[PDB]
C-alpha cells in the first residue's frame, strides 16, 4: 500500500495478504483489524469512485453487489477485532456504526450486524451511546428496529448510562425522536421505573432553574425588539413572543413564578391583548401600547437581574429541596467498574455566577460523601463539548499507550459535560482553576499596573488602530510590545508558588500541557482562544480549555475579524516557559504529540468523521457555510491533510519536525497577530 497506493489492482492483492495473515494467526488482533479496515476502505473507495464517475441503472446494481462483497467481511472483521482488543475497540466500534447506519438497511449487512451484536459484549457499546441515540429516529426501519433492541439491553444492564441522554431525547421538539425515546423508556420502566421518574423530574427542575421566566422574557424581548425596531419583522416578532405567553399559560408552579405573574404577568397579559388586537386590526397605535408595556417590564427586569446574585431552592424549585437519597447517580460519574456514586442530596443554595449568560453553580452531595460541583449553563448547546470530550478521552488513551508520552506524563485535562436540552446542560466544575484574564487583572491591580496599558499605548500612538493598514498595524503592535515588559504571567507563577521546587514542577507541567493542547487544537481546528477561554490550575499547573464554540476553522471562515492564528502562542505564554524559549520543552513536546497522532491517524480520523457527519451537529457547518454533505467532506479532507503534514502544501509532504516549525512561525508571526480581534488580546 505504501509503495503502490489504493486502486483497482492493489485491493485484491492486499486482501489476499491480510486474509493469509488472518489464517496463519487467528487470535492476532492486528491481523483482523488490518483486514477489517482494508475491506472498509475498499468500500469507501468504490463508493467515492461511483460518485466520481456515475454521478458526475446497472452500475448502482453492480455497486450493490460490489460493496456488499466487501461489507460483510468488514463487519465480521471489526466485530472480531473488538473482542480481541478488549478495551481499545473505540475505532472499530465506530466503524461498525458507520457501516451499520450507511448500509445496514440491506438484509445481508443487517444479518451480519445482528450476529455481531449478539457476539459482542454489551459493555463495548457504552462508549458510543451518544452516537446511537443520535440516530434514534433513523428513517430506515430495519436499522432503527435493531437500535431500539440494542438500547433495550443497554437499559437492562447499566441503565445509569442511558437515562440522561434518553431523558433529553424524550423532550425533543421533533416528534420522531421523542416518540422513539418514549417507546424505549416504556421498556426501561418495567425493569426499574424508579430511575425514569426520578431523572424526568430532576431534569425538568434543572431546566426550570437553568432558565427562569424573567430570563426567558428578557432574551425574548431583546430578540423581538431587534426584529421590530431593527428589521421590521412583525410576524417574526410574534413568533418569538407567543411561546413565552404559552409558557406562562401553564401557571405559577413555584413561588418565584407566582411573584413574577403577580408583578409582571398582569402587564404581559395586557400587552398580549394589544398584540391580539393588532392581529385582527393592524394599527400602529395598538402595537405601540404593547411595546410600552413590554419595555416597562423589560426595564424592570433589567433592573432586577443584577440583584439576582443567588437563588434559593425553597423558592425556585422546592421539588429539588425535597429530593433526598436519590438512586439516580451523579451525572458523568457512572462507571461499570466503580460503585455507583448516587446522589445523596442537593445543596439548598445556588451561587449564580455573574456573567453574560449567568450560569449557576450546582453542587451535589454524593453517597460516598464527597461534594460534586457543576456549572449549569443555559442557552448554550453542549453536544459539541460532549463530542469534543470524547475526542480528548481518545487522545489521552493514545498518549498513555505511547511509552515516550507516558514517561513525560502527557495528557489533556478534561471535565464532565452532561447536556440536559438543546439549550441548557450541566458542565462539571473544575476546581482550583481561574481564567488567565483574571490572573493578569489581579496581578496588575496588585502591582498598580494599568490593565489595558498595551491597548492604551496603541491608541495613544495611533488612535485609528482598527482602521490602519496591515503594515501600520504591525508597527503599532511592535511598538507596544517593545514598550511593555511581557513577563506578568512568569512573575506571578513564581510569586504564587510556595517554593522553588514546586514552582519548577508547575512550570514543567504547564509547558507540556500547553504544547499538547496547541497541537490537538490545531488538528481539531479550535479557534477563538482568548484569555477568558483558558484557565490555569493553581496546583497542578496544567492549562484547561473551555467553551469550544468555534471549531473546524470557523474563526478563519468568518468575514468579521478573521483569526489567522492556528493556536495561541503569545509572548506572555512563551515567557512563562523556560528562559531559552520555545526551542526547549515546547518544541520537543510538540514533536512527540504530532508523531503519535500521525501514527494513529486512522483512529483519530474515524472519530472525527462520525460526529461531523451527524445530522444533529450539521447545523454548525451549515451556519459556517455562506450542499451540507459537500461542506462536511471538505472539512474532513483538510483535517486529513493536517495529520499527513500536507496541509501547508498539497504537492509536497512535510515531515513532523518541518511541519511543527512552520506552525510555530505562523502562530508567532507579527503580521498574523495584528489582524486578530483586539478582544483576543494579542499583546498578552
Amino acid at each position: 500500500l505504501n509503495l503502490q497506493g489504493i486502486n483497482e489492482s492493489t485491493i485484491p492483492k492486499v486482501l489476499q495478504y491480510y486474509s493469509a495473515a488472518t489464517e496463519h494467526d487467528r487470535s492476532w488482533y492486528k491481523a483482523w483489524h488490518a483486514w477489517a479496515v482494508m475491506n472498509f476502505e475498499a468500500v469507501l473507495h468504490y463508493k467515492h469512485q461511483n460518485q466520481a464517475r456515475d454521478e458526475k441503472k446497472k452500475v448502482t446494481e453492480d455497486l450493490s453487489k460490489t460493496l456488499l462483497m466487501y461489507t460483510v467481511p468488514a463487519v465480521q472483521g471489526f466485530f472480531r477485532s473488538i473482542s480481541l482488543s478488549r478495551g481499545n475497540n473505540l475505532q472499530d466500534t465506530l466503524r461498525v456504526l458507520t457501516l451499520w447506519f450507511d448500509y445496514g438497511h440491506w438484509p445481508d449487512v443487517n444479518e451480519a450486524l445482528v450476529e455481531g451484536v449478539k457476539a459482542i459484549q454489551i459493555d463495548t457499546w457504552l462508549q458510543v451511546i451518544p452516537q446511537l441515540i443520535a440516530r434514534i429516529d433513523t428513517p430506515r426501519p430495519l436499522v432503527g428496529r435493531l437500535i431500539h433492541q440494542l438500547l433495550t439491553d443497554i437499559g437492562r444492564y447499566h441503565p445509569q448510562a442511558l437515562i440522561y441522554p434518553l431523558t433529553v431525547a424524550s423532550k425533543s421538539t421533533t416528534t420522531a425522536r421523542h416518540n422513539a425515546a418514549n417507546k424505549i423508556l416504556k421498556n426501561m420502566c418495567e425493569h426499574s421505573n424508579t430511575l425514569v421518574q426520578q431523572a424526568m423530574m430532576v431534569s425538568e427542575e434543572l431546566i426550570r432553574v437553568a432558565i427562569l421566566w424573567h430570563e426567558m422574557w428578557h432574551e425574548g424581548l431583546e430578540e423581538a425588539s431587534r426584529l421590530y425596531f431593527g428589521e421590521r419583522n412583525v410576524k417574526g416578532m410574534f413568533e418569538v413572543l407567543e411561546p413565552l405567553h404559552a409558557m406562562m399559560e401553564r401557571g405559577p408552579q413555584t413561588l418565584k413564578e407566582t411573584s413574577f405573574n403577580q408583578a409582571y404577568g398582569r402587564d404581559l397579559m395586557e400587552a398580549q391583548e394589544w398584540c391580539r388586537k393588532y392581529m385582527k386590526s393592524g394599527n400602529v397605535k395598538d402595537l405601540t401600547q404593547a411595546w410600552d408595556l413590554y419595555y416597562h417590564v423589560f426595564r424592570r427586569i433589567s433592573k432586577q437581574l443584577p440583584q439576582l446574585t443567588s437563588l434559593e431552592l425553597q423558592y425556585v424549585s422546592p421539588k429539588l429541596l425535597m429530593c433526598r437519597d436519590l438512586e439516580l447517580a451523579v451525572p458523568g460519574t457512572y462507571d461499570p467498574n466503580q460503585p455507583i456514586i448516587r446522589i445523596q442530596s442537593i445543596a439548598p443554595s445556588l451561587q449564580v455566577i455573574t456573567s453574560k449568560q449567568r450560569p449557576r453553580k450546582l453542587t451535589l452531595m454524593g453517597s460516598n460523601g464527597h461534594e460534586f460541583v457543576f456549572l449549569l449553563k443555559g442557552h448554550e448547546d453542549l453536544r459539541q463539548d460532549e463530542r469534543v470530550m470524547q475526542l480528548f478521552g481518545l487522545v489521552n488513551t493514545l498518549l498513555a499507550n505511547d511509552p515516550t508520552s507516558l514517561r513525560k506524563n502527557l495528557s489533556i485535562q478534561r471535565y464532565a459535560v452532561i447536556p440536559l436540552s438543546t439549550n441548557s446542560g450541566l458542565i462539571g466544575w473544575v476546581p482550583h482553576c481561574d481564567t488567565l484574564h483574571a490572573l493578569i487583572r489581579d496581578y496588575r491591580e496588585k502591582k498598580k499596573i494599568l490593565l489595558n496599558i498595551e491597548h492604551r499605548i496603541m491608541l495613544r500612538m495611533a488612535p485609528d488602530y482598527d482602521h490602519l493598514t496591515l503594515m501600520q498595524k504591525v508597527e503599532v503592535f511592535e511598538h507596544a510590545v517593545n514598550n511593555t515588559a511581557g513577563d506578568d504571567l512568569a512573575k506571578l507563577l513564581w510569586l504564587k508558588s510556595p517554593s522553588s521546587e514546586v514552582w519548577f514542577d508547575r512550570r514543567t507541567n504547564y509547558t507540556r500541557s500547553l504544547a499538547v493542547m496547541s497541537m490537538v487544537g490545531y488538528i481539531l481546528g479550535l479557534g477563538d482562544r482568548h484569555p477568558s477561554n483558558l484557565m490555569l490550575d493553581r496546583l497542578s499547573g496544567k492549562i484547561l480549555h473551555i467553551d469550544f464554540g468555534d471549531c473546524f476553522e470557523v474563526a478563519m471562515t468568518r468575514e468579521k475579524f478573521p483569526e489567522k492564528i492556528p493556536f495561541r502562542l503569545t509572548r506572555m505564554l512563551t515567557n512563562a516557559m523556560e528562559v531559552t524559549g520555545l526551542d526547549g520543552n515546547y518544541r520537543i513536546t510538540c514533536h512527540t504529540v504530532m508523531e503519535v497522532l500521525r501514527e494513529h491517524k486512522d483512529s483519530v480520523m474515524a472519530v472525527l468523521e462520525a460526529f461531523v457527519y451527524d445530522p444533529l451537529l450539521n447545523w454548525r457547518l451549515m451556519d459556517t457555510n455562506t450542499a451540507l454533505n459537500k461542506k462536511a467532506i471538505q472539512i474532513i479532507n483538510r483535517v486529513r491533510d493536517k495529520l499527513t503534514g500536507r496541509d501547508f502544501s498539497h504537492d509536497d509532504t512535510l515531515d513532523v519536525p518541518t511541519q511543527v516549525e512552520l506552525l510555530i512561525k505562523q502562530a508567532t508571526s507579527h503580521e498574523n497577530l495584528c489582524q486578530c480581534y483586539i478582544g483576543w488580546c494579542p499583546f498578552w
Partner: protein, 317 residues
C-alpha cells in the same frame, strides 16, 4: 501652495494634511481629514487638485484655493484604499484596496460608481501605472504581481517568491527596469522587454538585492532612472544606483545608541525635480529633506502630532 511651483504636502494619523514649503520649511495651510487616517497622497499631473486616499473614501483637495472642503469624495469602497494612481491625461484615476478588487474612476464623469474592475486573489497593496499609460501593475499580499492591460485586460500574473506580501513596486519613467519589494526585505528588479503594441511586457529577473534585514516598505526610481531608493522598517532609507545595484548612499534615522527601541519606521522616498535632493517621511513625526550625494539632512519638517505615512512632491512647471 498651488501658485508656488514646488508642492510638498504631508499627512498622517493626526487627521490633517499640511502643505509645507521646500525652500523655507513652514506650514502654509492645513486641511482636515476626519473619519480616518491618510494612506497615500498624490498630486495630479495637471496640479489642479491633490488626492488623499483614506478609509472607504478617496478624497481630493484643492491645490490652488486655500481652506476648501474636499472637492471629490469618492465613496462606495471598503477595507481602506492602499494607493491611488493618476492618468497623465487627467481623465482616469486608479486605486487599490484590501477588497481584492482594483478599480478605475473617471474624474470627468459625475458618476459615483467606478468604471472598470480587476478582481484578484489577495488584497492589493500597491498600484503603479506604466508610463506608456497602457499597463497597470498590481501587487498583492500573496506575492502575485499582475499587469492588467488597459486595452486587452490580459493580466500576466507573476510570483517572484511564494507566500511573501509584496508591499510596494515601482517602474522608472523610461520603462527600462521595474523594481518590486516584499516584507522579507528583498528588491526584485525586472528588465522590461521593449514591447508597446505587442504588449508582451516580459519581466526578466535581473537581481534580487538583499536590501534590508526587516520589512521593506517603499521603493521608487528617480526621474533620472539612475537611482533606486528603498525604505524599510530598519530606520534606514537606502539608495541603490540603477546601473550597478550598489548602495550609493544610506540615509538612516537611527539613534546611534543601543538603548532606543522603535524610534520609527521609514517609508518615504521622493526624489527632487533633478534628483539632487530627496524628501523622506518617518514615523518619528518628522519629514526630512535629505541630500542625495552627500547624505545630509538639509531641512527637517516638524509639527505633526502623530506619525507621518504619506508624502507629496511636485516640481512640475
Amino acid at each position: 501652495v498651488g501658485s508656488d511651483p514646488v508642492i510638498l504636502a504631508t499627512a498622517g494619523y493626526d487627521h490633517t494634511v499640511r502643505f509645507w514649503q521646500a525652500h523655507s520649511g513652514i506650514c502654509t495651510r492645513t486641511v482636515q481629514h476626519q473619519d480616518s487616517q491618510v494612506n497615500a497622497l498624490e498630486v495630479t499631473p495637471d496640479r489642479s487638485m491633490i488626492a488623499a486616499a483614506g478609509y472607504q473614501h478617496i478624497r481630493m483637495y484643492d491645490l490652488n484655493s486655500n481652506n476648501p472642503n474636499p472637492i471629490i469624495s469618492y465613496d462606495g469602497v471598503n477595507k481602506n484604499i492602499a494607493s491611488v494612481g493618476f492618468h497623465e491625461d487627467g481623465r482616469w484615476m486608479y486605486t487599490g484596496g484590501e477588497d481584492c478588487t482594483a478599480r478605475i474612476w473617471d474624474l470627468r464623469s459625475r458618476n459615483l460608481q467606478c468604471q472598470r474592475i480587476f478582481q484578484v486573489n489577495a488584497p492589493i497593496n500597491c498600484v503603479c501605472l506604466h508610463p506608456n499609460q497602457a499597463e497597470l501593475i498590481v501587487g498583492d499580499q500573496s506575492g502575485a504581481i499582475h499587469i492588467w492591460d488597459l486595452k486587452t485586460d490580459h493580466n500576466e500574473q507573476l510570483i517572484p517568491e511564494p507566500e511573501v506580501s509584496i508591499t510596494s513596486a515601482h517602474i522608472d519613467p523610461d520603462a527600462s527596469y521595474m523594481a518590486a519589494v516584499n516584507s522579507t526585505g528583498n528588491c526584485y528588479v525586472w528588465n522590461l522587454t521593449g514591447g508597446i503594441g505587442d504588449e508582451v511586457t516580459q519581466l526578466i529577473p535581473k537581481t534580487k538585492i538583499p536590501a534590508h534585514t526587516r520589512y521593506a516598505l517603499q521603493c521608487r526610481f528617480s526621474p533620472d532612472s539612475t537611482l533606486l531608493a528603498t525604505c524599510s522598517a530598519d530606520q534606514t532609507c537606502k539608495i541603490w544606483r540603477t546601473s550597478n545595484f550598489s548602495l550609493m548612499t544610506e540615509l538612516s534615522i537611527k539613534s546611534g545608541n543601543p538603548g532606543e527601541s522603535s524610534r520609527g519606521w521609514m517609508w518615504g522616498c521622493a526624489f527632487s525635480g533633478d534628483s539632487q535632493y530627496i524628501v523622506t517621511a518617518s514615523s518619528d513625526n518628522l519629514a526630512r529633506l535629505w541630500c542625495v550625494e552627500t547624505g545630509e539632512i538639509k531641512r527637517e519638517y516638524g509639527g505633526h502630532q502623530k506619525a507621518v505615512v504619506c508624502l507629496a512632491f511636485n516640481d512640475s512647471v
